[PDB]
Design an enzyme around this catalytic site. Structure first.
Site, PDB file in Angstrom:
ATOM      1  N   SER A  29       0.862  -0.975  -0.091  1.00  0.00           N
ATOM      2  CA  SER A  29       0.013   0.026  -0.053  1.00  0.00           C
ATOM      3  C   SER A  29       0.734   1.359  -0.044  1.00  0.00           C
ATOM      4  O   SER A  29       1.701   1.329  -0.959  1.00  0.00           O
ATOM      5  CB  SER A  29      -0.896   0.202   1.276  1.00  0.00           C
ATOM      6  N   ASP A  61     -11.003  -3.334  -4.216  1.00  0.00           N
ATOM      7  CA  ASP A  61     -10.093  -2.653  -3.385  1.00  0.00           C
ATOM      8  C   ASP A  61     -10.507  -1.597  -3.331  1.00  0.00           C
ATOM      9  O   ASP A  61     -10.354  -0.533  -4.065  1.00  0.00           O
ATOM     10  CB  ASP A  61      -8.715  -2.888  -3.592  1.00  0.00           C
ATOM     11  N   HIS A  80      -8.700  -4.480   0.071  1.00  0.00           N
ATOM     12  CA  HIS A  80      -7.188  -4.185   0.285  1.00  0.00           C
ATOM     13  C   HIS A  80      -6.393  -4.917   1.131  1.00  0.00           C
ATOM     14  O   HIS A  80      -5.092  -4.740   1.266  1.00  0.00           O
ATOM     15  CB  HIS A  80      -7.277  -2.731   1.323  1.00  0.00           C
TER      16      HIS A  80
END
Length: 204
Positions: free
Chosen positions: A105, A155, A186
């Site tokens: 991320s 996501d 995610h």
């Protein structure tokens, strides 16, 4: 500070000539998130795992978003320049060989921008759920660069089209790029970790 010490970080000195493995936590994580994960992965890579230098009332990250979430481009450029140096400087210190990175991320995001701005630094990179909003100007990488993108197709943080597009951008720098998808959000699936293991097995 000193220059390879520019971020606070964990380290595990590896064998000379073996990879420099740098791992970059997500928003809210820190230097222990990914350390043993990657010690386990490259049993003898020199391993390097920094905590980000921005704190978002509490949660640590590698560069600033404005409130309501849009990336600060001056801070991103600042941080990209810091990371690059930090990595080059540890390369010297440990007399490491290939540089490999893995990020999740927010960490895949700083790592992705390094891939873009220093296209010739990394040999391998794994991007876990990256989000890149802008269109990268394309400079050529090394033909041996290998990148892995892992991503969720639902996501809420990483629009499919932006992953699909980052993919093509990197793919245009040269080297290989592989994206492994999962339905889902995610979250990192065990399936992503598999692909990570299969991907880095080429490196030791």
């Amino acid at each position: 500070p000193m220059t390879k010490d520019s971020y606070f970080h964990k380290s595990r000195a590896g064998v000379a000539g073996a990879p420099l493995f740098v791992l970059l936590h997500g928003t809210g994580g820190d230097e222990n998130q990914f350390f043993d994960f990657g010690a386990r992965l490259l049993p003898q890579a020199t391993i390097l795992s920094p905590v980000g230098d921005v704190s978002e009332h509490g949660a640590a990250r590698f560069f600033r978003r404005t409130g309501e979430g849009v990336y600060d481009m001056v801070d991103l450029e600042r941080a990209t320049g810091k990371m690059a140096d930090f990595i080059k400087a540890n390369r010297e210190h440990y007399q490491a060989g290939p540089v490999i990175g893995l990020g999740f991320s927010n960490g895949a995001n700083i790592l992705a921008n390094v891939l873009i701005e220093q296209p010739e630094l990394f040999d391998a990179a794994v991007l876990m759920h990256p989000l890149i909003p802008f269109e990268p100007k394309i400079s050529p990488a090394k033909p041996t660069r290998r990148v892995l993108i892992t991503a969720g197709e639902r996501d809420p943080i990483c629009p499919v089209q932006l992953t699909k597009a980052l993919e093509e951008s990197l793919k245009a720098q040269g080297g290989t790029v592989e994206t492994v998808w999962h339905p889902g959000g995610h979250e990192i699936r065990s399936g992503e970790i598999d692909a990570v293991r299969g991907f880095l097995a080429a490196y030791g």
